[PDB]
Design a protein around this ligand. Structure first.
Ligand SMILES: [Fe+3]
Ligand SMILES: [Fe+3]
Ligand SMILES: [Fe+3]
Ligand SMILES: [Fe+3]
Lengths: 200, 238, 238, 200, 238, 200, 200
């Protein structure tokens, strides 16, 4: 069968992932430009929301050294791939949970709808990649919103997950933090209430 | 805006390290116990940030000069350079390579690093680089040293550098570790051994590159990095 | 009624696939975590049904005709024959052999199979035969085709036929799959790989059998099946 | 040492076991003679009962595609091996839990007592082998009845199980289904309450 | 009109199958007995048709839809793709590849095939594709099945697809056949044995290509074709 | 010695070559555009001729499943390589002998004179490649005209054939078919009168 | 693939085959019971006939050391396998061409019709195996009759020979030798008018 060149293998990000990818979070001087946690400037179109969550290991303890990359569409359901800190909206960002901040947070707007490859709509969601010491290869997940139940019920990816009880672990719960629309999305890596992770 | 025009060859998860590798202690509690769920590739998966317009500093790739507090760092001066190609051998141009490492004594410039090898006042240990049209990157830096960690009672990581590469999408994104040719610590590391296949470990060993060294100045190492191959969609939805 | 005169060779649980084989994803939640409890053989275990008296229709073993709805199925016509013996080499006469499979395009005739290859109006995919005195069975079918299934993101099972053999007792009963000589999907399948030893994998591979083929009509494959060795009791309860 | 021909290796029955051994249960045309869940016709000696249950995976979720074959003595503690659709009682039978009917059922008589090899009597019991997608080699278990605690305490097989809490996972609970004596046996493949499985 | 500016590498007639190969019976009365006459290359042999303006229908390379009688063909869905290069390794762009083959059971859609495997109402079995700028071509079809034929008393042609390739001249034109990786019929076929060198047979074997397959859809094979090497003229008539 | 990659080896076109390339002659439905035996449309320049022939095996029986491909200059001695169904003349074409047409036919014009690589004129000719079941690699030949005797005699390609009697087998014999100028050209594959074949 | 034990390879019968199988033909003393050229005693049922022929090598020279064996149906079309010199008719004989007699003869009856395996009647025929120095493995042919024209047209085995001209090499010509009905069947091993030989 046809073998191609094999992909470089992954390795853990390690305890100090902050020093190279989260300069301010590890409290080291930053550079002019940083890829960080604010995907939307106050004047970007859409409903502005705040995202927050915590990450738990299999013993129910807090992972205080994880790093997270997020990828989502803008409010009109479009992916903004040209990263520029002058943009009113960037579809990419990074955040982290530190020994200080047990909780990560992201400032952005609610994604519009994008279609799958077959033409079917997917429910608004935000793609997340989780990195940390003890993770050999990163984990991929999706964050969907509880106030979108109708679109959630017909999401064709959410629908690939066989058990209904597991679909709920990907559903972030609407709250209000300082009178601003917030949703909490906690990640359980292992055991009871274990978040669904994907491969693609 | 970004368009759904490519698919990426599936990952071989038996080549990459599996999630639960008990000898690397920390993986026991941080590995999932359910199976991952396979989902077909859409626009959410086949697109990613392009960092062409990120404002880069003039020394963002030179760790000999980017931290600087009146001097040069102590250790072996080396250039680490290579090419970023996909599994079809097609270069990956304008892609973001980030890297971070210890100093010459193995000390990490981080609040939680308490090892007794001292900090080096002219060394930060962070660098980034946009590959050129041909997929090449280079960083200039000093060779890191090994360090003990608390896994087993006498575990030593080999000298290494951490590396992150964006690639053309969130499906190609990869964090990895570069090791140095002939380091005897490499087969004893439980983090390197989370990779079951020995041909896969080889892929992470940077080889000494004399042809790239600056005579009387610094040695060079060559690290090429392969990302998931990319192909056009074909015969999809008919 | 049935008598306790037989004892059967203990199953080797390192030759059969183990219950937890993570690459085969559905095995993760369906494998026990406690150890099995070993119990001596009594009559509850050394006896089992004899189906010499089941009323077999006349095409039960013939898949080319048994579904019938106008014609012949579309696909490679092959005969699948072999012999059923125990581990001592003895034949196992008048024992039940049941088989089912997908059609020439990999489609199963079952409500839950949504794969897009179509159904074949002349094909059903089920057969049964009771071995003759010498331990022989034969079927006449069409070679089935590979089907993609949701384990990994691009997993494909090899062409296979499912088998169910009763043998002389509920201790000997087994269900397995037959693979076809040379299919390059075999070494890649996680279900094939749940078997750790490669010599065990070989035993599932039917071999092209040009001596049994009917010229100008259909090919033949041979597939022999080995059930647990049977022995008389000796020196029991003194 | 002496080696014999190795046994053929086992493979999962797969998700489509029904099309091969449960033609009816997978809504497909049946043949004249099918081997199914009615072990006893109404004119058969013994106490007529009705067995039922569900199979759970380790996540607590129903296993909806399992397939079970049963073997048991008639009312007089004798195994009837000569399978025939005409016999008033057959020692063998097959049932399945489907997507439509998530619980298996069996119609039989309560088995008489048989002896072990040493001549010592075993509590009345049904021998069950379980198959399904996900199970590489089939599971052996035995069903015992709750209203036979004197025999269940003497049983040389129940007493081989070291821990008594595990012996309880093999004892079916008595009930009634439109006043027709029924016993309920739920199989927990993995986890908390895990059914005992045997090797022989 | 066409110019005489190329010469072609000479054919290695001990690599290709010779004309007289007695186990392939019809070759007996259809092989010349006199030696071929060798003649130099002129404008007649070094020019040939170019099909860049033939008007291809949109489904011409897609055998799942170009015959269409309301539905899909029954059989294994597969993409058959590869590149056409010359012996110097140079791609051969805008060339015509044509291919014809049986259905899932080995029946050809032609008056004279009275094999008893039935026709597939939705399959015709013909495709044509002009290669791109890079030498690539592709088809979509079903895997053909083997067929018995009247050579020896029990001869089975393995599964195959016939290819016809034009190249840049009537000097490069070729007709050949593609076989499938692992088919145990490949080495018993007299037509395949008409090639004396075992390494010449390996080039006719298409290899399973998981990288190019559509997940949950169809598998892919890769077949690359090398035509006679093309060079510029030099030092001619002094 | 320098070794290049080896060419893909030839296999016989097989008995069913008509389904892939002689669509019409196999009485299968055609596509919009097929390559066939009409090189010149009735208004192309030159002397219009019809060619016909039969092919023989070495027992002297007819080859009814052969397939031919022809390449000739136009009446000005120019090779027309851009194949188009709208052009008046195409230099390439295909024909076949079937169970119902023991005979092939082609409609074209007498080709004009082309020179070889050394500057020397070749007599008018048509290059022929013959394919069929039983032929493992195709056969190359040239058809020449019996009315061009003088040019035929100074032809540098016909003069490489050593024996004069062999040169005759390449000469098509002029005749008339319903007022149209025709030439016959039989091909003997093997035996007495064996047509000369080339290697180039 | 499945390989069985290989059959013992053939070797030529050599020039002296007469000494072991044609004892009177080689002028040596015969045993009590010899298998020879008289399949039918005179009181057997059917048309009595004399078969005769000559065997020719590829140069047109006679093969004077050949040995043949025939197998045929009786007049009802049944094959009589129990060989016994007492029977009236025996389905097998042997004959030979010697330096003395360039011609072999057989005495027997015209075979009746037998069906092939699909039940399509074959023309009457005699199965022949030819042995000789020079013939590494024996040649199988069929002798058919010129007076069974209607049936020879519909024989499924003769209709397997592709070329009509070749089917005639299998037809013996009707004659008279001394008032008896005779068929002449000459065999051409090689060359012009080569007899068709079969593999099965
Ligand atoms: Fe580190
Ligand atoms: Fe299956
Ligand atoms: Fe063919
Ligand atoms: Fe001798």
């Amino acid at each position: 069968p046809i073998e191609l060149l094999p992909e470089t293998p992954s390795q853990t990000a390690g305890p100090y992932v902050h020093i190279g990818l989260a300069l301010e979070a590890a409290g080291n001087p930053t550079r002019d430009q940083e890829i960080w946690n604010r995907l939307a400037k106050p004047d970007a179109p859409g409903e502005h929301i705040l995202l927050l969550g915590q990450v738990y290991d299999g013993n129910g303890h807090l992972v205080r050294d994880s790093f997270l990359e997020v990828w989502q569409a803008d409010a009109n359901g479009e992916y903004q791939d040209a990263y520029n800190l002058e943009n009113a909206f960037n579809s990419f960002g990074r955040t982290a949970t530190t020994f200080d901040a047990g909780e990560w947070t992201l400032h952005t707007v609610k994604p519009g709808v994008v279609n799958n490859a077959a033409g079917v709509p997917m429910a608004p969601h935000i793609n997340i990649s989780l990195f940390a010491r003890g993770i050999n290869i990163h984990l991929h997940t999706r964050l969907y919103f509880d106030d979108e139940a109708q679109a959630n019920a017909k999401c064709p990816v959410l629908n690939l997950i066989e058990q209904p009880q597991r679909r709920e672990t990907l559903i972030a719960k609407r709250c209000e933090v300082d009178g601003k629309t917030a949703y909490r999305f906690d990640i359980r890596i292992q055991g009871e209430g274990e978040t669904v992770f994907f491969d693609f | 805006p970004a368009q759904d025009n490519s698919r990426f060859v599936i990952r071989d998860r038996n080549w990459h390290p599996k999630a639960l590798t008990p000898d690397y202690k920390t993986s026991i509690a941080r590995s999932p116990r359910q199976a991952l769920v396979s989902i077909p590739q859409s626009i959410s998966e086949t697109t990613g940030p392009n960092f062409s317009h990120l404002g880069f500093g003039a020394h963002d790739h030179d760790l000999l000069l980017n931290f600087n507090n009146g001097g040069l760092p102590i250790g072996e001066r080396i250039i680490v350079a290579g090419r970023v190609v996909d599994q079809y051998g097609k270069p990956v141009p304008n892609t973001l390579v980030e890297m971070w490492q210890a100093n010459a004594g193995g000390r990490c410039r981080h609040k939680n690093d308490r090892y007794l090898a001292p900090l080096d006042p002219n060394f930060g240990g962070v660098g980034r680089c946009l590959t050129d049209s041909d997929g090449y990157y280079s960083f200039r830096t000093i060779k890191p040293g090994p360090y003990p960690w608390r896994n087993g009672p006498n575990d030593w990581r080999p000298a290494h550098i951490h590396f992150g590469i964006s690639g053309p999408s969130i499906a190609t994104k990869l964090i990895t570790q570069l090791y140095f040719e002939g380091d005897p610590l490499i087969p004893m590391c439980p983090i390197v051994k989370s990779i079951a296949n020995p041909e896969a470990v080889q892929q992470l060993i940077a080889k000494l590159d004399m042809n790239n060294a600056n005579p009387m100045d610094c040695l060079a190492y060559r690290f090429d990095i392969v990302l998931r191959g990319q192909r056009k969609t074909h015969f999809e939805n008919c």
